[PDB]
CSV table of C-alpha atoms in Angstrom, one decimal:
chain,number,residue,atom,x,y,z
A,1,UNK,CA,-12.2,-14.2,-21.7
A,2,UNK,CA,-9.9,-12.8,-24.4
A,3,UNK,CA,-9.7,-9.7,-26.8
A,4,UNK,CA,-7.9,-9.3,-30.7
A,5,UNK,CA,-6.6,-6.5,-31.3
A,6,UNK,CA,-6.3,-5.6,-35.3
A,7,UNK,CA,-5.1,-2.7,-37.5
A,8,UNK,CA,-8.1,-2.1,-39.7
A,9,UNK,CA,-7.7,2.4,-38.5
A,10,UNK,CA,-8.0,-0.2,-35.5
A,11,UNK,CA,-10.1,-2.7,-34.3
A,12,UNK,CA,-10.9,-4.3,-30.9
A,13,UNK,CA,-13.0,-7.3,-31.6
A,14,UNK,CA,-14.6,-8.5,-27.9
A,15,UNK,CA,-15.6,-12.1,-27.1
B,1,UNK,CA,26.5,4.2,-15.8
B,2,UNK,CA,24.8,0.8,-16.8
B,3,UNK,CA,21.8,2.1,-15.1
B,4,UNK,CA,19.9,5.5,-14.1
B,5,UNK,CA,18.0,6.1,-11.0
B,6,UNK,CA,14.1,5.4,-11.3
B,7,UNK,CA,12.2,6.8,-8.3
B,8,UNK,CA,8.9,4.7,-7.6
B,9,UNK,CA,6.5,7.1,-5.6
B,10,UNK,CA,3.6,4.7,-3.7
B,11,UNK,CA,0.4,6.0,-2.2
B,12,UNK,CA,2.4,5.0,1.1
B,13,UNK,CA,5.9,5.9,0.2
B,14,UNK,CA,8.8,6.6,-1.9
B,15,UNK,CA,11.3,4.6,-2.9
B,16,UNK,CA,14.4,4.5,-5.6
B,17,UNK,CA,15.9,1.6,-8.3
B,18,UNK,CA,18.4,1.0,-11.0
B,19,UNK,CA,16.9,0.3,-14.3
B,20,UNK,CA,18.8,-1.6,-17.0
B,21,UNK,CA,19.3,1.2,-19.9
B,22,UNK,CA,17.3,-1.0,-21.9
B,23,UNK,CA,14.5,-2.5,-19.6
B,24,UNK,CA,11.3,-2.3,-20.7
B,25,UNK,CA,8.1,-1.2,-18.7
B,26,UNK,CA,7.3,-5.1,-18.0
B,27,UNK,CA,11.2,-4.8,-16.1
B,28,UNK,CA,10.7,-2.2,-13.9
B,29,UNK,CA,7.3,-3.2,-13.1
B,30,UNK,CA,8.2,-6.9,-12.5
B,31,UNK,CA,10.9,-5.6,-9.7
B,32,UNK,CA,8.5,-2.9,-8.3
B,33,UNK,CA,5.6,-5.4,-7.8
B,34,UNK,CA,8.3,-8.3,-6.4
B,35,UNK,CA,9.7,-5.7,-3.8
B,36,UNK,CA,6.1,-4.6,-2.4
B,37,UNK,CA,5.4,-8.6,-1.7
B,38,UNK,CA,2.2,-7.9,-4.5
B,39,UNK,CA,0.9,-10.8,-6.4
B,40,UNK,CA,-2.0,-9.2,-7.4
B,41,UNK,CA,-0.6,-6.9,-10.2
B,42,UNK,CA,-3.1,-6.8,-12.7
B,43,UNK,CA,-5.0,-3.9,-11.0
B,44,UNK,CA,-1.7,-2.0,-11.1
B,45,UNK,CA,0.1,0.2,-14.2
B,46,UNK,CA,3.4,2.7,-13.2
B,47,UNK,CA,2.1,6.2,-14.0
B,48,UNK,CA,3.6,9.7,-15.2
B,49,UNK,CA,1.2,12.7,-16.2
B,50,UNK,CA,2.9,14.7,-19.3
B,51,UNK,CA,1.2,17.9,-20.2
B,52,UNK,CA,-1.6,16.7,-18.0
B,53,UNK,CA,-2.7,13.6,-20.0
B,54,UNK,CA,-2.0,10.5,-17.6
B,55,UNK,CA,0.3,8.2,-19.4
B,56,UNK,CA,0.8,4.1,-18.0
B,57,UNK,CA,4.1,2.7,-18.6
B,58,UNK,CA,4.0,-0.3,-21.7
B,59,UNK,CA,5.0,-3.4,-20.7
B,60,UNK,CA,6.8,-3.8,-23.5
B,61,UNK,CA,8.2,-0.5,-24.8
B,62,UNK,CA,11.8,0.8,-22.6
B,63,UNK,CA,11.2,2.7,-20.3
B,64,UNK,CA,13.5,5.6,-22.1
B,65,UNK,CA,11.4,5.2,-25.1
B,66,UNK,CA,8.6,6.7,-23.3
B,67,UNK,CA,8.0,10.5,-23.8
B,68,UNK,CA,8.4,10.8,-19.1
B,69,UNK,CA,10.5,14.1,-18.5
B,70,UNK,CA,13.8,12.3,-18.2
B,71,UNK,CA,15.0,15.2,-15.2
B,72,UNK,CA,16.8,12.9,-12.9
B,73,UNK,CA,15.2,11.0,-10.9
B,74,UNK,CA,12.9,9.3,-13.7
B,75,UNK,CA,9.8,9.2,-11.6
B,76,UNK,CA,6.7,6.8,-12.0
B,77,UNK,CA,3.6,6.8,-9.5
B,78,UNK,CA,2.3,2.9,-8.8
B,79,UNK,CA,-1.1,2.8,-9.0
B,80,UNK,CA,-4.6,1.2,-9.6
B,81,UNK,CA,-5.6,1.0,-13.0
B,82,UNK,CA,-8.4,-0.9,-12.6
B,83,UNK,CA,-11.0,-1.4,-9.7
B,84,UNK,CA,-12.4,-4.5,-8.9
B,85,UNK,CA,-16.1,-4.9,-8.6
B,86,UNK,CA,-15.8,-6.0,-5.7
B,87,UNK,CA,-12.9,-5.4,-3.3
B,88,UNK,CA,-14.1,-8.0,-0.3
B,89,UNK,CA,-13.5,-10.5,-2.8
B,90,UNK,CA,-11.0,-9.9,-5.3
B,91,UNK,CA,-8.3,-8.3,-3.1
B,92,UNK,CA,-6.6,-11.4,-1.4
B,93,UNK,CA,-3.1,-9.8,-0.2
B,94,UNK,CA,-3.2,-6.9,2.9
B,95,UNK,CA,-0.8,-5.1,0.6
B,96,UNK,CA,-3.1,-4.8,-2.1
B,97,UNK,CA,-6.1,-3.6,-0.1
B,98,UNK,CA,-4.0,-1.2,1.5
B,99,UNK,CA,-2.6,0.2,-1.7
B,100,UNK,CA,-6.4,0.3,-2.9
B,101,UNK,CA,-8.1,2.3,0.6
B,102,UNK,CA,-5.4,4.8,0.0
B,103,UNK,CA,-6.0,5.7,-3.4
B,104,UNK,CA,-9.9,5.8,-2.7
B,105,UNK,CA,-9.8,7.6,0.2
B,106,UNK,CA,-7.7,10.3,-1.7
B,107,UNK,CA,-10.3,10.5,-4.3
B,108,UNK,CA,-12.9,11.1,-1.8
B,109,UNK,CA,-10.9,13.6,-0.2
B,110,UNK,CA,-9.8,15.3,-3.8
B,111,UNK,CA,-13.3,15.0,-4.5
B,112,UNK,CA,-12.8,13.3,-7.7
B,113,UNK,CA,-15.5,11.0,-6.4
B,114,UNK,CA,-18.5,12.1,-4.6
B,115,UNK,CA,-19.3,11.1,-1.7
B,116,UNK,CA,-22.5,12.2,0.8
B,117,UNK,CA,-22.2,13.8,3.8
B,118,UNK,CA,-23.2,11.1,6.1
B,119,UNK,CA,-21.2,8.2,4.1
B,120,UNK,CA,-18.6,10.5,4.4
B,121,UNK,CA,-18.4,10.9,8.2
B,122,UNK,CA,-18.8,6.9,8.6
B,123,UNK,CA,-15.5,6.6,6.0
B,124,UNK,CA,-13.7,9.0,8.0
B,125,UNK,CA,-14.6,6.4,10.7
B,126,UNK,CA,-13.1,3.7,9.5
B,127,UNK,CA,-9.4,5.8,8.2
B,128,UNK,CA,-9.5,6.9,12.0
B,129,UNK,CA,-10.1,3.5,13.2
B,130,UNK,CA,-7.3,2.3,10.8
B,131,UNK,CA,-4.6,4.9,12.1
B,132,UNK,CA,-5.3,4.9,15.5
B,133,UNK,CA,-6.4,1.4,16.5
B,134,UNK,CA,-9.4,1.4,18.9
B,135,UNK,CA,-10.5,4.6,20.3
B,136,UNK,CA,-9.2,5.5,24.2
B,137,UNK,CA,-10.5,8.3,25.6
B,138,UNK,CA,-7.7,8.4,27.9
B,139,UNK,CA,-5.4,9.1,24.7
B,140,UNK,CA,-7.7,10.4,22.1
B,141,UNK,CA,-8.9,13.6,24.4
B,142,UNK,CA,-11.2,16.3,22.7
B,143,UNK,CA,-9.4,17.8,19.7
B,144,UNK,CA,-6.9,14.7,18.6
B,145,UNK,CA,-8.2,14.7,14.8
B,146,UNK,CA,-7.9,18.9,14.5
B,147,UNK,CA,-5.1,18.6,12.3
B,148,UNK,CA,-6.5,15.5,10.4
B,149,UNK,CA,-7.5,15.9,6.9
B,150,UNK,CA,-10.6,13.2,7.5
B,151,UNK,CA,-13.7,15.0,5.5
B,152,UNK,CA,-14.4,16.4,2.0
B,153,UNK,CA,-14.4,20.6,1.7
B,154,UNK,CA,-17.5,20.1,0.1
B,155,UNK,CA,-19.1,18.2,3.1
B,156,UNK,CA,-17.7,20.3,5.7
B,157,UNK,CA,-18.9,23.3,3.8
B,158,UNK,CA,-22.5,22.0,3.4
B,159,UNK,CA,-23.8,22.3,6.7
B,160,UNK,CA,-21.3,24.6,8.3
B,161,UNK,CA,-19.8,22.7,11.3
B,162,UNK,CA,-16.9,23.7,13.7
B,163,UNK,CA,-14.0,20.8,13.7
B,164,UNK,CA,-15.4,19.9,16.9
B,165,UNK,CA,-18.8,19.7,15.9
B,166,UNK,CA,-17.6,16.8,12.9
B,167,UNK,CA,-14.8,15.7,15.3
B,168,UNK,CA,-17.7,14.3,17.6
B,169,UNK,CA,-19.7,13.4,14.5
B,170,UNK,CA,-16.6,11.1,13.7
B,171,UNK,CA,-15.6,10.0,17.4
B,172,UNK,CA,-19.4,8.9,18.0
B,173,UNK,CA,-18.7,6.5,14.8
B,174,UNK,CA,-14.9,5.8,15.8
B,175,UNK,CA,-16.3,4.2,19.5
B,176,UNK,CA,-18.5,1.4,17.5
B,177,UNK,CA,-15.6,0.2,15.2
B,178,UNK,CA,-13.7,-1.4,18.7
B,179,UNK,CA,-12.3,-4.0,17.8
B,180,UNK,CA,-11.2,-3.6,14.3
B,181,UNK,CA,-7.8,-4.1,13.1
B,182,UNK,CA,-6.1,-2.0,10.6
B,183,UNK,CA,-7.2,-4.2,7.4
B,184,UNK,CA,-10.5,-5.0,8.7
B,185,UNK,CA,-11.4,-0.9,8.7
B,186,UNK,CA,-9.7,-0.3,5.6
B,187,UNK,CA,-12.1,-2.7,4.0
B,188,UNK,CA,-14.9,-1.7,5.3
B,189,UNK,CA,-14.1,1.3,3.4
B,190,UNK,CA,-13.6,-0.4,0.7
B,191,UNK,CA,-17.1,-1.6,0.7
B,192,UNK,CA,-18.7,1.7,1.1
B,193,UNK,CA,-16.6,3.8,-1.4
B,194,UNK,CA,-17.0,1.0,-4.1
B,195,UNK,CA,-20.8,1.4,-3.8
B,196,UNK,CA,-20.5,5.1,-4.7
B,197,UNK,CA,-21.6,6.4,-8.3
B,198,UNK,CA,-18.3,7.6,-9.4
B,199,UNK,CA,-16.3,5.1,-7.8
B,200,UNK,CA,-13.9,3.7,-10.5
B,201,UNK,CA,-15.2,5.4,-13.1
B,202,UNK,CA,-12.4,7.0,-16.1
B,203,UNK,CA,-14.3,9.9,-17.5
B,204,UNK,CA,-13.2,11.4,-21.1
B,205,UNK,CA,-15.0,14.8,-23.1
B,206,UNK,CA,-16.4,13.5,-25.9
B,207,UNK,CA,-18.7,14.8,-28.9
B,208,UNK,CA,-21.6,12.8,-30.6
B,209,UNK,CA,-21.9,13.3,-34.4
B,210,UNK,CA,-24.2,15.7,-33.7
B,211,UNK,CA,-21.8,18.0,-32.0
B,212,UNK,CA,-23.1,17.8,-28.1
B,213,UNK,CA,-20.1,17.8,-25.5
B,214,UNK,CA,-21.0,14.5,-23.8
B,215,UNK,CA,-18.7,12.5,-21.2
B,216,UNK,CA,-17.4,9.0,-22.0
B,217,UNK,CA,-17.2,6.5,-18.7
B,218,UNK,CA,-14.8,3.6,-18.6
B,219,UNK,CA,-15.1,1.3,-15.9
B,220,UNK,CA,-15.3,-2.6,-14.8
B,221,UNK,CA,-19.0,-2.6,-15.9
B,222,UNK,CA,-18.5,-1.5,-19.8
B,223,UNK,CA,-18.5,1.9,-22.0
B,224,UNK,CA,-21.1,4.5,-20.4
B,225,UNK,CA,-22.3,7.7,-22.0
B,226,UNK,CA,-22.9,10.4,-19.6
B,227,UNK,CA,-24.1,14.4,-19.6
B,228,UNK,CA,-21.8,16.7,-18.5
B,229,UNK,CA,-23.6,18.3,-15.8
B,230,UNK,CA,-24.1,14.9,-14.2
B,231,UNK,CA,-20.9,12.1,-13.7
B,232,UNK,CA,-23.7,10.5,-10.9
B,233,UNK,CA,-26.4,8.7,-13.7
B,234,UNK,CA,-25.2,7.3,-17.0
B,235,UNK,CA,-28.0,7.9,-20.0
B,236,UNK,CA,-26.2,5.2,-21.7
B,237,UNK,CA,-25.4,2.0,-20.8
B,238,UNK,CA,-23.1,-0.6,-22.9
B,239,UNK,CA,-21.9,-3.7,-20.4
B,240,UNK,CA,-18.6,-5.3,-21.9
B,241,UNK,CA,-20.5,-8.6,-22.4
B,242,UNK,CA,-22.4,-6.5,-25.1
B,243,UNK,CA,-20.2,-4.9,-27.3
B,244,UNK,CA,-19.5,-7.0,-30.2
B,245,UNK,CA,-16.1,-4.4,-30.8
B,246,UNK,CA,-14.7,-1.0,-30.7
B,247,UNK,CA,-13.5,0.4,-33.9
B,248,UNK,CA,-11.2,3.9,-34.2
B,249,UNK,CA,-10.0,5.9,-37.1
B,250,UNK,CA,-9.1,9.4,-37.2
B,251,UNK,CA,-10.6,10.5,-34.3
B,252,UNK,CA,-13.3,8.9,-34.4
B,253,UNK,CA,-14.7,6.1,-31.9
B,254,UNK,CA,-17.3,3.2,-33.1
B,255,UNK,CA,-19.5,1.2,-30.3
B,256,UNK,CA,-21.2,-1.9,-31.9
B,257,UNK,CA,-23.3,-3.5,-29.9
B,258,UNK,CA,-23.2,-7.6,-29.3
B,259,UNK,CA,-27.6,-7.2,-30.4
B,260,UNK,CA,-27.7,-6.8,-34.0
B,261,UNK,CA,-30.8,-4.4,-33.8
B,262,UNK,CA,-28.8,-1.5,-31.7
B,263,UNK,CA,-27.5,1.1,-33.9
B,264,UNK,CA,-23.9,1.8,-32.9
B,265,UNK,CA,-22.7,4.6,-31.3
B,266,UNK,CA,-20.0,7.2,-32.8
B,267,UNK,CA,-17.9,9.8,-31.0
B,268,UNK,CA,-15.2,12.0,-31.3
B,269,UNK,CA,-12.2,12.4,-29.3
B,270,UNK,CA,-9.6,15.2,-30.3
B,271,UNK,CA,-6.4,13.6,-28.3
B,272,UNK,CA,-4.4,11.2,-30.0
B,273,UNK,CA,-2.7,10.6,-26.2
B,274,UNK,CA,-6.4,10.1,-24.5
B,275,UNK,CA,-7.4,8.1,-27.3
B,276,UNK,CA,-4.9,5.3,-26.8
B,277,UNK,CA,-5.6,5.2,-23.1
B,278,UNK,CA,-9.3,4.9,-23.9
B,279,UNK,CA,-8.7,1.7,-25.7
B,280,UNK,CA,-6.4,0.6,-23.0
B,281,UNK,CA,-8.8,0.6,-20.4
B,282,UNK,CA,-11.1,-0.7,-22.8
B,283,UNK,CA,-8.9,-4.1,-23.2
B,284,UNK,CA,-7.9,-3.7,-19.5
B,285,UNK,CA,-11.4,-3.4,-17.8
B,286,UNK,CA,-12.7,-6.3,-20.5
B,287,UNK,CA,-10.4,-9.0,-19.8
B,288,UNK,CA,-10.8,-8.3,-16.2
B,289,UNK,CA,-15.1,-8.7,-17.0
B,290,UNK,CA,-15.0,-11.4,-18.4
B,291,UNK,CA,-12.9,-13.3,-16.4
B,292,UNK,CA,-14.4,-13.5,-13.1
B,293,UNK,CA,-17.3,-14.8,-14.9
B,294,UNK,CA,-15.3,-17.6,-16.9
Protein backbone atom coordinates (compact mmCIF):
# COMPACT_ATOMS: atom_id res chain seq x y z
CA UNK A 1 0.00 0.00 0.00
CA UNK A 2 3.14 2.13 0.07
CA UNK A 3 5.35 4.25 -2.36
CA UNK A 4 9.58 5.20 -2.28
CA UNK A 5 10.37 7.98 -3.38
CA UNK A 6 14.18 8.30 -4.68
CA UNK A 7 16.48 10.90 -6.23
CA UNK A 8 17.83 9.07 -9.27
CA UNK A 9 16.58 12.81 -11.70
CA UNK A 10 13.73 11.16 -9.46
CA UNK A 11 12.14 8.12 -9.10
CA UNK A 12 8.72 6.89 -7.84
CA UNK A 13 8.95 3.15 -7.45
CA UNK A 14 5.03 1.79 -6.90
CA UNK A 15 4.14 -1.43 -5.09
CA UNK B 1 3.76 39.75 16.52
CA UNK B 2 4.37 36.04 17.34
CA UNK B 3 1.85 35.25 14.73
CA UNK B 4 0.27 36.69 11.36
CA UNK B 5 -3.21 36.33 10.34
CA UNK B 6 -4.01 33.22 8.00
CA UNK B 7 -7.41 33.48 6.33
CA UNK B 8 -8.87 29.89 5.57
CA UNK B 9 -11.54 30.33 2.71
CA UNK B 10 -14.02 26.93 2.71
CA UNK B 11 -16.40 26.07 -0.10
CA UNK B 12 -19.00 27.04 2.77
CA UNK B 13 -17.25 29.91 4.49
CA UNK B 14 -14.53 32.02 5.51
CA UNK B 15 -12.79 32.07 8.44
CA UNK B 16 -9.38 33.61 10.08
CA UNK B 17 -6.16 31.99 12.48
CA UNK B 18 -2.89 32.77 14.05
CA UNK B 19 -0.12 30.85 12.73
CA UNK B 20 3.12 30.29 14.61
CA UNK B 21 5.86 32.24 12.46
CA UNK B 22 7.35 29.02 12.08
CA UNK B 23 4.51 26.38 11.62
CA UNK B 24 4.73 24.29 8.92
CA UNK B 25 1.90 23.37 6.40
CA UNK B 26 1.15 20.05 8.61
CA UNK B 27 0.31 23.07 11.63
CA UNK B 28 -2.02 25.02 10.03
CA UNK B 29 -3.65 22.13 8.46
CA UNK B 30 -3.84 20.06 11.74
CA UNK B 31 -5.87 23.25 13.40
CA UNK B 32 -8.01 23.82 10.21
CA UNK B 33 -9.12 20.12 9.93
CA UNK B 34 -9.58 20.01 14.12
CA UNK B 35 -11.85 23.14 13.95
CA UNK B 36 -14.15 21.87 11.02
CA UNK B 37 -14.89 18.51 13.30
CA UNK B 38 -13.04 16.57 9.96
CA UNK B 39 -11.46 13.32 10.50
CA UNK B 40 -11.35 12.46 7.21
CA UNK B 41 -8.39 14.68 5.95
CA UNK B 42 -6.62 12.76 3.55
CA UNK B 43 -8.95 13.89 0.68
CA UNK B 44 -8.05 17.49 1.73
CA UNK B 45 -4.67 19.85 0.84
CA UNK B 46 -4.86 23.97 1.69
CA UNK B 47 -4.64 25.59 -1.71
CA UNK B 48 -3.23 29.03 -3.21
CA UNK B 49 -2.99 29.59 -7.19
CA UNK B 50 0.33 31.71 -8.06
CA UNK B 51 0.57 32.84 -11.58
CA UNK B 52 -2.26 30.45 -12.23
CA UNK B 53 -0.50 27.10 -11.40
CA UNK B 54 -2.41 25.61 -8.29
CA UNK B 55 0.03 25.14 -5.57
CA UNK B 56 -0.95 22.64 -2.14
CA UNK B 57 0.54 23.66 0.97
CA UNK B 58 3.67 20.95 2.21
CA UNK B 59 3.09 19.40 5.17
CA UNK B 60 6.28 19.83 6.12
CA UNK B 61 7.79 23.04 4.64
CA UNK B 62 6.50 26.67 6.80
CA UNK B 63 4.06 28.06 5.66
CA UNK B 64 6.27 31.41 4.95
CA UNK B 65 8.62 29.27 3.02
CA UNK B 66 6.06 28.94 0.45
CA UNK B 67 6.22 31.26 -2.58
CA UNK B 68 1.73 32.38 -1.44
CA UNK B 69 1.57 36.30 -2.07
CA UNK B 70 2.26 37.16 1.59
CA UNK B 71 -0.44 40.49 1.18
CA UNK B 72 -2.09 40.30 4.51
CA UNK B 73 -4.33 38.23 5.10
CA UNK B 74 -2.21 35.00 3.94
CA UNK B 75 -4.98 33.25 2.31
CA UNK B 76 -5.37 29.39 1.62
CA UNK B 77 -8.60 27.66 0.03
CA UNK B 78 -9.41 24.09 1.85
CA UNK B 79 -10.09 21.71 -0.54
CA UNK B 80 -10.43 18.19 -2.13
CA UNK B 81 -7.38 16.90 -3.43
CA UNK B 82 -8.46 13.70 -4.11
CA UNK B 83 -11.83 12.08 -4.94
CA UNK B 84 -12.88 8.87 -3.68
CA UNK B 85 -14.14 6.28 -6.02
CA UNK B 86 -16.81 6.01 -4.37
CA UNK B 87 -18.40 8.75 -2.19
CA UNK B 88 -21.44 6.50 -0.57
CA UNK B 89 -18.73 4.59 0.89
CA UNK B 90 -15.73 6.39 1.71
CA UNK B 91 -17.24 9.63 3.03
CA UNK B 92 -18.25 8.63 6.76
CA UNK B 93 -18.54 12.30 8.39
CA UNK B 94 -21.65 14.78 7.12
CA UNK B 95 -18.87 17.38 7.07
CA UNK B 96 -16.93 15.70 4.66
CA UNK B 97 -19.67 14.92 2.18
CA UNK B 98 -20.78 18.37 2.47
CA UNK B 99 -17.42 19.83 1.83
CA UNK B 100 -17.24 17.30 -1.27
CA UNK B 101 -21.18 18.16 -2.95
CA UNK B 102 -19.99 21.74 -2.89
CA UNK B 103 -16.90 21.48 -4.65
CA UNK B 104 -18.62 19.11 -7.31
CA UNK B 105 -21.52 20.93 -7.79
CA UNK B 106 -19.26 24.01 -8.53
CA UNK B 107 -17.48 22.11 -11.09
CA UNK B 108 -20.60 21.23 -12.84
CA UNK B 109 -21.73 24.60 -12.66
CA UNK B 110 -18.02 26.13 -13.86
CA UNK B 111 -18.28 23.50 -16.35
CA UNK B 112 -14.95 22.07 -15.61
CA UNK B 113 -16.86 18.78 -15.59
CA UNK B 114 -19.42 17.90 -18.12
CA UNK B 115 -22.40 17.07 -17.34
CA UNK B 116 -25.73 16.17 -19.76
CA UNK B 117 -28.57 18.03 -19.92
CA UNK B 118 -30.93 15.65 -18.28
CA UNK B 119 -28.34 14.58 -15.41
CA UNK B 120 -28.06 17.96 -15.02
CA UNK B 121 -31.68 18.93 -14.34
CA UNK B 122 -31.94 15.76 -11.81
CA UNK B 123 -28.52 17.32 -9.85
CA UNK B 124 -30.12 20.57 -9.71
CA UNK B 125 -32.88 18.43 -8.07
CA UNK B 126 -31.17 17.23 -5.48
CA UNK B 127 -29.03 21.04 -4.53
CA UNK B 128 -32.74 22.30 -4.43
CA UNK B 129 -33.95 19.56 -2.36
CA UNK B 130 -30.79 20.15 -0.06
CA UNK B 131 -31.47 24.03 0.37
CA UNK B 132 -34.89 24.08 0.65
CA UNK B 133 -36.02 20.90 2.50
CA UNK B 134 -39.07 19.27 0.91
CA UNK B 135 -40.87 21.18 -1.69
CA UNK B 136 -44.33 23.21 -0.51
CA UNK B 137 -46.20 24.68 -2.99
CA UNK B 138 -47.65 26.90 -0.52
CA UNK B 139 -43.98 28.43 -0.15
CA UNK B 140 -42.16 27.51 -3.21
CA UNK B 141 -44.80 29.50 -5.67
CA UNK B 142 -43.96 29.75 -9.43
CA UNK B 143 -40.63 31.52 -9.90
CA UNK B 144 -38.74 30.78 -6.29
CA UNK B 145 -35.47 29.36 -8.07
CA UNK B 146 -35.32 32.59 -10.74
CA UNK B 147 -32.46 33.92 -9.06
CA UNK B 148 -30.86 30.42 -8.45
CA UNK B 149 -27.77 29.57 -10.16
CA UNK B 150 -29.00 25.57 -10.46
CA UNK B 151 -28.00 24.63 -14.28
CA UNK B 152 -24.86 24.69 -16.53
CA UNK B 153 -24.83 27.81 -19.38
CA UNK B 154 -24.03 25.19 -21.59
CA UNK B 155 -27.31 23.15 -20.84
CA UNK B 156 -29.49 25.97 -20.65
CA UNK B 157 -28.15 27.22 -23.92
CA UNK B 158 -28.68 23.87 -25.69
CA UNK B 159 -32.18 23.72 -26.05
CA UNK B 160 -33.13 27.24 -25.47
CA UNK B 161 -35.62 27.26 -22.48
CA UNK B 162 -37.12 30.20 -20.54
CA UNK B 163 -36.25 30.01 -16.52
CA UNK B 164 -39.67 28.83 -16.22
CA UNK B 165 -39.56 26.28 -18.68
CA UNK B 166 -36.28 24.57 -16.59
CA UNK B 167 -37.78 25.86 -13.32
CA UNK B 168 -40.63 23.26 -13.90
CA UNK B 169 -38.20 20.79 -15.43
CA UNK B 170 -36.50 21.03 -11.91
CA UNK B 171 -39.70 21.39 -9.57
CA UNK B 172 -41.22 18.25 -11.45
CA UNK B 173 -37.83 16.46 -10.06
CA UNK B 174 -37.83 18.50 -6.66
CA UNK B 175 -41.68 16.95 -5.73
CA UNK B 176 -40.19 13.11 -5.90
CA UNK B 177 -37.19 13.81 -3.61
CA UNK B 178 -39.99 14.36 -0.38
CA UNK B 179 -38.60 13.18 2.20
CA UNK B 180 -34.90 13.69 1.86
CA UNK B 181 -32.84 15.41 4.32
CA UNK B 182 -30.03 17.74 3.58
CA UNK B 183 -27.17 14.93 3.55
CA UNK B 184 -29.31 12.39 2.01
CA UNK B 185 -29.75 14.85 -1.33
CA UNK B 186 -26.34 15.96 -1.25
CA UNK B 187 -25.33 12.31 -1.68
CA UNK B 188 -27.35 11.39 -4.06
CA UNK B 189 -25.44 13.86 -5.96
CA UNK B 190 -22.61 12.61 -5.06
CA UNK B 191 -23.47 9.35 -6.75
CA UNK B 192 -24.50 10.83 -9.99
CA UNK B 193 -21.55 13.45 -10.45
CA UNK B 194 -18.96 10.74 -9.56
CA UNK B 195 -20.26 8.58 -12.44
CA UNK B 196 -19.55 11.39 -14.85
CA UNK B 197 -16.40 11.16 -17.32
CA UNK B 198 -14.52 14.02 -16.06
CA UNK B 199 -15.44 13.65 -12.63
CA UNK B 200 -12.07 13.82 -10.57
CA UNK B 201 -10.08 13.86 -13.26
CA UNK B 202 -6.50 16.48 -13.00
CA UNK B 203 -5.80 17.20 -16.60
CA UNK B 204 -2.10 18.42 -17.64
CA UNK B 205 -0.84 19.52 -21.59
CA UNK B 206 1.59 17.23 -22.44
CA UNK B 207 3.77 16.30 -25.55
CA UNK B 208 4.74 12.63 -26.71
CA UNK B 209 8.35 12.29 -28.07
CA UNK B 210 6.95 12.65 -31.16
CA UNK B 211 5.78 16.22 -30.61
CA UNK B 212 1.75 15.75 -30.52
CA UNK B 213 0.02 18.10 -27.76
CA UNK B 214 -1.67 15.32 -25.88
CA UNK B 215 -3.51 15.67 -22.31
CA UNK B 216 -2.19 13.80 -19.20
CA UNK B 217 -5.26 12.55 -16.65
CA UNK B 218 -4.56 11.99 -13.05
CA UNK B 219 -7.09 10.50 -11.04
CA UNK B 220 -8.08 7.62 -8.31
CA UNK B 221 -8.00 5.02 -11.26
CA UNK B 222 -4.17 5.55 -12.50
CA UNK B 223 -2.20 7.85 -15.24
CA UNK B 224 -4.50 8.33 -18.49
CA UNK B 225 -3.52 9.63 -21.86
CA UNK B 226 -6.05 11.60 -23.49
CA UNK B 227 -6.61 13.86 -27.02
CA UNK B 228 -7.11 17.20 -26.69
CA UNK B 229 -10.27 17.58 -28.37
CA UNK B 230 -11.84 14.94 -26.12
CA UNK B 231 -11.32 15.01 -21.85
CA UNK B 232 -14.62 12.36 -22.16
CA UNK B 233 -12.57 8.93 -23.49
CA UNK B 234 -9.02 8.11 -22.49
CA UNK B 235 -6.89 6.36 -25.52
CA UNK B 236 -4.66 5.25 -22.91
CA UNK B 237 -5.20 3.55 -19.92
CA UNK B 238 -2.45 2.77 -17.07
CA UNK B 239 -4.39 1.65 -13.55
CA UNK B 240 -1.98 2.47 -10.53
CA UNK B 241 -1.89 -1.41 -9.77
CA UNK B 242 0.19 -1.44 -13.16
CA UNK B 243 2.75 0.85 -13.14
CA UNK B 244 5.86 -0.61 -11.90
CA UNK B 245 7.27 3.44 -11.37
CA UNK B 246 7.30 6.93 -12.64
CA UNK B 247 10.70 8.27 -13.47
CA UNK B 248 11.38 12.38 -14.22
CA UNK B 249 14.41 14.17 -15.38
CA UNK B 250 14.62 17.32 -17.10
CA UNK B 251 11.30 17.57 -18.23
CA UNK B 252 10.85 14.65 -19.13
CA UNK B 253 8.18 11.97 -17.69
CA UNK B 254 8.75 8.00 -17.84
CA UNK B 255 5.62 5.47 -17.47
CA UNK B 256 6.79 1.78 -16.93
CA UNK B 257 4.41 -0.50 -16.93
CA UNK B 258 4.02 -3.37 -13.99
CA UNK B 259 3.92 -6.13 -17.63
CA UNK B 260 7.35 -6.39 -18.79
CA UNK B 261 6.21 -6.57 -22.53
CA UNK B 262 4.56 -2.82 -22.60
CA UNK B 263 6.91 -0.40 -23.86
CA UNK B 264 6.85 2.66 -21.56
CA UNK B 265 5.52 5.71 -22.21
CA UNK B 266 7.53 9.18 -22.34
CA UNK B 267 6.29 12.74 -22.16
CA UNK B 268 7.17 16.15 -21.83
CA UNK B 269 6.00 18.75 -19.47
CA UNK B 270 7.60 22.31 -19.68
CA UNK B 271 6.55 23.51 -15.94
CA UNK B 272 8.80 22.74 -13.27
CA UNK B 273 5.66 23.94 -10.82
CA UNK B 274 3.06 21.44 -12.73
CA UNK B 275 5.55 18.89 -12.73
CA UNK B 276 5.88 18.51 -9.03
CA UNK B 277 2.19 18.57 -8.60
CA UNK B 278 1.93 15.78 -11.16
CA UNK B 279 4.00 13.51 -9.04
CA UNK B 280 2.07 14.61 -6.08
CA UNK B 281 -1.11 13.37 -7.18
CA UNK B 282 0.71 10.53 -8.49
CA UNK B 283 1.82 9.46 -4.79
CA UNK B 284 -1.48 10.95 -3.45
CA UNK B 285 -4.06 9.17 -5.76
CA UNK B 286 -1.74 5.75 -5.31
CA UNK B 287 -1.68 5.35 -1.77
CA UNK B 288 -5.26 6.13 -1.67
CA UNK B 289 -5.57 2.85 -4.63
CA UNK B 290 -4.13 0.75 -3.14
CA UNK B 291 -5.33 1.00 0.09
CA UNK B 292 -8.93 0.34 -0.12
CA UNK B 293 -7.88 -2.80 -1.62
CA UNK B 294 -5.37 -3.86 1.14
Amino acid sequence: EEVELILGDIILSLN
Amino acid sequence: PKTFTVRIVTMDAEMEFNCEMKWKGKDLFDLVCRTLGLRETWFFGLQYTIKDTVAWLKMDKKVLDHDVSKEEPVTFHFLAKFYPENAEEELVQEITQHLFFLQVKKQILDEKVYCPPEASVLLASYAVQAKYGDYDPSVHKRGFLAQEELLPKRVINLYQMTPEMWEERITAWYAEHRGRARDEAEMEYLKIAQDLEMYGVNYFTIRNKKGTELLLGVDALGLHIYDPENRLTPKISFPWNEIRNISYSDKEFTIKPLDKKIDVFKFNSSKLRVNKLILQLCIGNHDLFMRRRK
